[PDB]
Amino acid sequence: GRLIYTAGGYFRQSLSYLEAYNPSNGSWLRLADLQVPRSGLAGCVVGGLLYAVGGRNNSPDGNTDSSALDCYNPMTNQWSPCASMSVPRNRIGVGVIDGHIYAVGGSHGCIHHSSVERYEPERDEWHLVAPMLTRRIGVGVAVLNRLLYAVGGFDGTNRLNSAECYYPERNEWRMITPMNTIRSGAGVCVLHNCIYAAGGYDGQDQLNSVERYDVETETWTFVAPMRHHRSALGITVHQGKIYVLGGYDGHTFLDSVECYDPDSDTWSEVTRMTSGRSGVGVAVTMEPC
Ligand SMILES: Cn1nnc2cc([C@@H](CC(=O)O)c3ccc(Cl)cc3)ccc21
């Protein structure tokens, strides 16, 4: 589109912020709040609607996992409720294929989901598809060549370097080559022919390392590390550059936004969020009004 939207997140408690960054002028706009605070959600866009999916409201009144799908229209600057998912999914991953949204894994209390469901905007309806081979929360999800990939995460016991691929016409998951790094709460996105996995948590450390999967070669390769170690980051692609937003470095809920240039293999500090936060949902679409 034209703007990087960041929704929700966590600082001290789950957040309701919706803010949009303009790479062209470096500015931030605060837009309409989410109706319910949530961290550990995912964002995506389909047909110029921004969607906020799953997560959890960590608050002093209690902690509630979210099965919610909420619809944001930039023309109106209004959030509307859309169909809820079959199940709450905190620390969810999301992918869009052919205008359908795939909601992947995430947790509900001590339940770590391997289940996967698909949203159809024309019908405002969720349907379960084949489950992943592994339970994954803090799962990175990306789409390339109309195939969905679930990358790393946490299965309830172990943080994962494993990854798998969903073939829609076969309704089937298959393992792919595992990453060289255990990552839970990495940022996962696609750029050209490669699935990137940036940062994450291995159970001891928040990571600055970045690696990429070439679907043709089936191998993962390290690229330049980010400037900041970060888990529970938001990630998006805007005009052939990767943007990473916030996260947690073991000390600070980061406001730092970094930008990856694949030609020069370099990360650069691009802006700061209006406040530090982790577990945000990020997506790109056109300006509001
Ligand atoms: C203390 N700490 N630092 N980074 C962390 C990441 C997670 C993961 C989940 C896990 O692997 O247990 C995580 C948290 C939030 C999000 Cl949005 C994704 C993944 C949990 C605790 C962490």
From Swiss-Prot:
Site (Sensor for electrophilic agents): 110
Effect caused by changing residue 231 to A: Impaired interaction with SQSTM1/p62
Single annotated GO MF: transcription regulator inhibitor activity
Cellular compartment(s): Cytoplasm; Nucleus
Keywords for this protein: Cytoplasm, Kelch repeat, Nucleus, Repeat, S-nitrosylation, Thioether bond, Ubl conjugation, Ubl conjugation pathway
Effect after changing residue 184 to A: Impaired interaction with SQSTM1/p62
Residues in Kelch repeats: 3-48, 49-99, 100-146, 147-193, 195-240, 241-287
Gene Ontology CC: actin filament; centriolar satellite; Cul3-RING ubiquitin ligase complex; cytoplasm; cytosol; endoplasmic reticulum; inclusion body; midbody
Consequence of gene disruption: Early postnatal lethality caused by abnormal cornification. Mice survive until weaning and probably die from malnutrition resulting from hyperkeratosis in the esophagus and forestomach that cause gastric obstruction. Defects are caused by constitutive activation Nfe2l2/Nrf2, leading to constitutive expression of phase 2 detoxifying enzymes. Mice lacking both Nfe2l2/Nrf2 and Keap1 reverse the hyperkeratosis phenotype and are healthy and viable in normal conditions.
Modification S-cGMP-cysteine occurs at: 110
S-(2-succinyl)cysteine modification, residue list: 289
Posttranslational modification: Non-enzymatic covalent modifications of reactive cysteines by electrophile metabolites inactivate the BCR(KEAP1) complex. Accumulation of fumarate promotes the formation of cysteine S-succination (S-(2-succinyl)cysteine), leading to inactivate the BCR(KEAP1) complex and promote NFE2L2/NRF2 nuclear accumulation and activation. Nitric oxide-dependent 8-Nitro-cGMP formation promotes cysteine guanylation (S-cGMP-cysteine), leading to NFE2L2/NRF2 nuclear accumulation and activation. Degraded via a proteasomal-independent process during selective autophagy: interaction with phosphorylated SQSTM1/p62 sequesters KEAP1 in inclusion bodies, leading to its degradation.
One GO term (biological process): cellular response to oxidative stress
Free-text note on domains in this protein's UniProt record: The Kelch repeats mediate interaction with NFE2L2/NRF2, BPTF and PGAM5. KEAP1 contains reactive cysteine residues that act as sensors for endogenously produced and exogenously encountered small molecules, which react with sulfhydryl groups and modify the cysteine sensors, leading to impair ability of the BCR(KEAP1) complex to ubiquitinate target proteins.
Assembly, per entry: Component of the BCR(KEAP1) E3 ubiquitin ligase complex, at least composed of 2 molecules of CUL3, 2 molecules of KEAP1, and RBX1. Interacts with NFE2L2/NRF2; the interaction is direct. Forms a ternary complex with NFE2L2/NRF2 and PGAM5. Interacts with (phosphorylated) SQSTM1/p62; the interaction is direct and inactivates the BCR(KEAP1) complex by sequestering it in inclusion bodies, promoting its degradation. Interacts with NFE2L1. Interacts with BPTF and PTMA. Interacts with MAP1LC3B. Interacts indirectly with ENC1. Interacts with SESN1 and SESN2. Interacts with HSP90AA1 and HSP90AB1.
Function recorded in the entry: Substrate-specific adapter of a BCR (BTB-CUL3-RBX1) E3 ubiquitin ligase complex that regulates the response to oxidative stress by targeting NFE2L2/NRF2 for ubiquitination. KEAP1 acts as a key sensor of oxidative and electrophilic stress: in normal conditions, the BCR(KEAP1) complex mediates ubiquitination and degradation of NFE2L2/NRF2, a transcription factor regulating expression of many cytoprotective genes.
Family of the protein in this entry: Belongs to the KEAP1 family.
Protein's name according to its UniProt entry: Kelch-like ECH-associated protein 1
Naturally occurring in which organism (per UniProt): Mus musculus (Mouse)
Portion of the parent chain present: 325 to 613 of 624
